[PDB]
Ligand SMILES: N[C@@H](Cc1c[nH]c2ccccc12)C(=O)O
């Protein structure tokens with residue numbers, strides 16, 4: 001057995017890794033986390049619950065401390081018809097007589113948004129409902145993402161810095177050694193493996209396995225071990241962002257969802273926290289400058305509020321060829337990053353950590369096990385990359401240079417067959433990206449249909465079938481929607497009850 | 500819309516197609532079936548088909564000499580006299596790792612006895628239902644894609660009787676039955692089938708033609724020139740000999756199929772209500788049909804020359820495309836592999852369910868047709884890989900046949916799977932990645948049963964508290980104990996539904 005893990009870098013990636021290792025292995029692993037002093041709101045997947053449940057944490061403990069909110073999905077607005085929107089929900093499509101509701105909607109639906117017809121979540125979001133009743137009841141242990149069965153109906157918005165601080169307390173309580181210091185040199189042995197990290201004030205910190213959580217820097221994985229970073233700039237050019245913290249005047253405006261609003265040269269997130277929104281404009285500097293993007297952001301969400309400070313960021317978009325090199329594993333932005341259009345950041349960290357426990361090394365290091373880990377991590381990001389490019393290709397707007405350039409930009413290899421297929425009929429389990437990338441079929445279909453990649457006609461089988469069962473299911477969805485919105489409290493109301 | 504479907508060939512494939520089309524489309528499709536004038540096993544997911552049709556097993560199973568299947572018993576593939584079960588049961592998961600992984604770490608009792616209730620159910624010859632009909636553990640109109648929980652059993656049946664049953668169902672619902680021989684299959688100037696010319700009923704025309712003519716491939720191969728891809732290079736078994744053996748003692752009836760490794764192939768045992776079907780699948784490169792029949796008889800019915808042996812040649816592989824122009828092959832005409840994992844009915848079911856999903860309009864969209872072909876190809880290719888893994892895992896090396904199995908070429912995707920399997924267990928991300936009727940537990944159960952075992956257990960397990968896993972092993976044993984005491988025998992339950 002190996003004995004010791006050294007994690008370099010804190011934040012979400014570092015403290016998720018530290019807390020998880022201690023939850024998995026307790027006192028059968030030694031963990032040190034080294035982070036520098038020289039260092040906004042985020043969304044998650046519904047599946048982050050597996051992580052928190054694995055640690056033994058309940059949302060009533062941490063969510064309020066972390067300014068938290070509930071996320072029922074993402075509202076996409078202004079990507080195609082001006083002022084139109086639809087939701088991408090944490091909700092699977094129902095299946096009637098062997099065909100999902102999206103297939104039926106093409107045949108017998110009211111061709112308003114697909115999402116209004118097909119998902120309860122649409123109308124919950126329009127009514128701004130919480131996913132729990134005042135008594136805590138939902139409207140609908142140690143496990144991992146692989147144990148996802150039923151689609152859990154919500155995820156979280158939170159201040160990720162507060163979450164990281166919360167997890168640091170947990171991890172340190174469980175025996176993680178916390179060192180605040182700068183790494184001045186990374187030592188290697190004769191095989192090129194990492195032998196230790198040399199710190200300004202704590203000398204050399206050594207261990208069996210090193211975890212690189214140094215973010216875009218990639219201090220270990222790129223700067224030391226020569227890992228090759230593969231940029232996605234050719235297919236996804238957005239390289240910068242500018243963000244604002246906007247206090248909420250009226251509490252009941254709190255949305256139980258993330259919004260992704262297409263802008264002149266990129267898109268804007270709105271992440272509703274308890275008492276404020278975080279807004280961020282993600283853009284390509286080929287088409288707009290930082291000053292212009294700040295101006296557009298401000299005009300949209302906070303006109304006249306020069307008291308509110310903007311924060312500017314540059315992003316490294318892509319993935320490392322391998323995230324595990326020798327005795328070093330990259331987790332978080334050091335490993336890979338895509339723009340947060342589908343809230344994938346925390347998911348990438350979670351899957352990397354859960355798979356690190358699964359592929360944890362013995363004293364005899366195993367190149368076959370390591371290769372399987374590297375393949376899984378590459379598939380994860382590459383699948384998401386393809387899915388994200390389909391957003392830009394499906395968007396129907398062509399009003400600015402950015403949006404015109406989106407139409408004709410290069411695209412991933414596999415995405416041609418998918419676009420070909422999607423002109424004829426809906427994608428399904430067998431024709432979406434075939435390896436685990438955190439999304440299922442309904443997510444691919446929903447973005448296509450919402451944006452406007454629609455099949456030319458409905459599936460011919462449906463013209464031969466009795467439409468009554470499907471029509472009845474559309475009616476059930478409307479009625480269940482009606483009942484749920486009358487019964488549930490608002491997002492703010494519920495959160496306020498648990499503060 | 501197209502209007503009419505002509506099915507050429509009866510049997511399981513033809514009548515499953517005929518009945519499903521009428522179930523799916525009722526009076527919005529015209530269907531005609533033209534046909535000329537032992538025992539089989541299924542997957543648990545065949546229930547999606549029967550439920551779609553609206554049939555309850557208590558109607559048809561007794562009429563089809565039926566039995567229940569909890570899985571397959573694999574015997575004598577590796578150490579002489581050793582066996583294990585491949586069940587209709589998923590592995591439990593504790594603290595993020597399945598019971599096979601924990602078994603490697605804190606186990607050694609065979610893998611299948613420790614990990615699956617099914618093992619001891621089979622050893623005790625239990626039925627999966629209590630006499631009141633309750634399951635030990637209606638789908639309406641659903642398909643294979645709607646499989647969620649693992650349903651715990653499948654069927655053994657007389658497939659001729661199932662075809663007969665379905666024929667009655669289909670004809671009652673408006674299917675036109677024509678008993679005659681096809682003399683000529685007509686084609687138009689584009690090479691699309693125009694009609695089938697019969698001896699006594701003239702030309703039977705339609706919009707869509709379904710080839711259910713078996714290994715013949717009368718439409719898809721002989722008429723349309725479809726290319727057939729043989730698997731003989733990786734799966735050389737090309738013939739079978741079968742015998743029906745009446746069962747003397749009712750209580751000997753097993754709730755499972757047996758696959759017994761033989762000198763130059765393997766033998767199936769399929770238990771029906773009053774008899775077993777036994778068949779030796781072999782390669783004629785290694786044993787003659789006369790020798791094969793002698794070995795089968797010595798194994799299951801020595802001195803029973805009153806029982807007639809039936810000899811069969813098999814066409815092993817798949818059509819490159821099962822849908823060409825206005826013709827779709829279903830069953831043996833489309834593809835066939837040896838019945839080592841009971842795939843024959845599943846291949847028919849999937850092809851039919853996907854034909855409904857990919858049903859053509861008058862425009863005959865080629866993208867929709869292309870998609871169907873791709874699904875059908877992956878279905879069989881995945882099963883191809885899984886089956887070759889059986890022969891590669893088998894440890895016996897005692898005859899020319901088994902020695903040849905060790906060094907025979909394999910499909911290219913299998914090398915990686917073998918290299919992984921030497922190190923750790925396969926999982927959802929490393930088995931064959933497209934739908935092929937089997938999930939991760941099936942791949943790992945065959946590996947661990949046959950002997951492709953990781954060098955060492957998953958290192959992470961040595962860092963973890965083993966109590967939860969040991970408690971789950973204990974639950975499995977105790978649940979097994981309770982169930983074998985509570986459940987009736989396979990025969991008893993079946994007697995009770997006749
Ligand atoms: N499949 C993931 C992510 C996801 C599902 N639906 C979504 C809607 C929006 C954003 C992410 C998602 C989950 O179940 O949690």
Ligand SMILES: N[C@@H](Cc1c[nH]c2ccccc12)C(=O)O
Pocket residue numbers: 541542543544545570571585586587588649650840841936937938941
């Ligand atoms: N996956 C199929 C087939 C299957 C599962 N377990 C099996 C055991 C033996 C033979 C086939 C199977 C099913 O669930 O029904």
